[PDB]
Structure 1
Amino acid sequence: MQLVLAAKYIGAGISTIGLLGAGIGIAIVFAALINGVSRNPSIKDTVFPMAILGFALSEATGLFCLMVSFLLLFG
């Protein structure tokens, strides 16, 4: 158990690293949203739900990382 439990804990730490992509990704989507709206205010009702979709899809990949982390931590 001891070496295996230790591996799970190290593993759970390693598995959060990929969350960096969601962190950068979410920001990239919101940067585009802010730049697009500032170039063309009239487009905001159109581009805002693309921003919400984009952020959610990007966050999803981070959530897959987190899921593996929790399965290691608690499973």
Structure 2
Amino acid sequence: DIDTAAKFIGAGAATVGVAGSGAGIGTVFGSLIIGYARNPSLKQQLFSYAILGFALSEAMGLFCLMVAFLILFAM
């Protein structure tokens, strides 16, 4: 029963990788705040990019979560 134990440890290690997505979302929305303070007329378009940015970095993060479950539940 060392296999299931290592599956636990591997799921934990794999889900460590969400820190990058957290920091990336932080940077995206921080730069949105700054760039909107500078040129508040483009509030719409800037926000669009924000979503795009927030969608990409978080995507990578979700991958980790997916991989985590793939080590925890699938095999």
Fold equivalence (TM over 0.5): yes
The residue that corresponds to 1:50 in the other structure is 49
- Aligned-residue Cα RMSD (Å) equals 0.7
The residue that corresponds to 1:21 in the other structure is 20
In structure 1, stretches of 5+ residues that fail to align are: none
Identity value in percent: 61
1:62 and 2:51 matched: no
In structure 2, stretches of 5+ residues that fail to align are: none
1:39 deviates by 1.0
Greater helix share, structure number: 2
Aligned length: 74
1:17 deviates by 1.2
Instruction: Map Cα deviations across residues 36-61 of structure 1 (whole Å, 9 max, x no partner).
Output: 11111101111101000001100011
Mapped partners of 1:26, 1:32: distance in 2: 10
The amino acid that maps onto 2:47 is F
TM-score norm. by structure 2 comes to 0.94
TM-score norm. by structure 1 comes to 0.94
The residue that corresponds to 1:31 in the other structure is 30
